Amino acid sequence: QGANISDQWTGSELPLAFASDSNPSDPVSNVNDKLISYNNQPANRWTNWNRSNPEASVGVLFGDSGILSKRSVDNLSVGFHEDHGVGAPKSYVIEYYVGKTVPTAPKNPSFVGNEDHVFNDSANWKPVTNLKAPAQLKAGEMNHFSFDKVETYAIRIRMVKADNKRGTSITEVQIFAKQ
Ligand SMILES: CC(=O)N[C@@H]1[C@@H](O)[C@H](O[C@@H]2O[C@H](CO)[C@H](O)[C@H](O)[C@H]2O)[C@@H](CO)O[C@H]1O
Ligand SMILES: [Ca+2]
């Protein structure tokens, strides 16, 4: 297992977690802060609980030594959280950035859908290929995904909430460079 290329680094803008939208008290910066909690002691999670769109994406924009960098990516791990109102999503696509335009850091990363940004244009994304995933997603553990290696500025997971919940919930993601 190589470098963790998703963790926040102190005094560095990158790498940076981003989301299309969020529950304001559950900001998307929670998914790469190296805290993992499946309860409220402490509560630590991104969610879109009680937001208007049932679908939302969460992603990592990559960095090397403080500045923007393409990374070679073939994996993703997601720790889904559940309670009475949030849970793992009923469906998901895992996508990577292909835009010719070099992406900038969003101004408000927890709510990328609310500003003009390359991430909001679906022509800038393609699905990963030859995905290996769990047969069923589970809250309460890191769910591991792998796929064909790609050189990208960013990957995201785009998710629709389960019908019996008010949002999707993630305590932490982790992405690793090749050994
Ligand atoms: C008693 C009551 O309804 N309290 C609510 C809280 O549930 C709510 O917090 C959110 O709850 C959802 C539960 O699925 C999830 O845990 C979210 O992460 C969390 O923010 C709060 C919203 O600020 O309002 C209270 O009314
Ligand atoms: Ca976390």
Residue numbers in the entry: 1466 to 1644
Sentences from the paper on this structure:
The N-terminal region of BgaA comprising amino acid residues 138–993 has amino acid sequence identity with GH family 2 enzymes. Through detailed structural and functional analyses the molecular basis for the catalytic specificity of BgaA is defined and this activity is demonstrated as critical for the ability of pneumococci to utilize complex N-linked glycans as a carbon source and protect the bacterium from opsonophagocytic killing. Further analyses also revealed the presence of non-catalytic CBMs within the C-terminal region of BgaA that mediate adherence to host cell surface LacNAc and/or lactose.
However, fold prediction using the Phyre2 server, which does not rely on amino acid sequence similarity, distinguished two regions (XII and XV) with a high probability of adopting the β-sandwich fold common to many CBMs found in CAZymes. The two predicted CBMs were recombinantly produced and the polypeptides screened for binding to all commonly occurring monosaccharides by UV difference spectroscopy; only D-galactose gave a signature UV difference spectrum consistent with sugar binding. Subsequently, this approach was expanded to the relevant galactose-containing sugars LacNAc, lactose, galactopyranosyl-β-1,3-N-acetyl-D-glucosamine (lacto-N-biose), and galactopyranosyl-β-1,3-N-acetyl-D-galactosamine [Thomsen-Freidenreich (TF) epitope] and binding was only observed to LacNAc and lactose. A single bound metal ion was modeled as Ca2+ on the basis of coordination geometry and B-factor analysis. The shallow LacNAc binding site sits at the apex of the β-fold opposite the N- and C-termini. Tryptophan 1514 lies directly beneath the glycoside bond and coplanar with the disaccharide thus providing CH-π interactions with both pyranose rings and a higher affinity for β-linked disaccharides than for galactose alone. This binding site architecture accommodates lactose and LacNAc, but would limit the recognition of other sugars terminating in β-linked galactose.
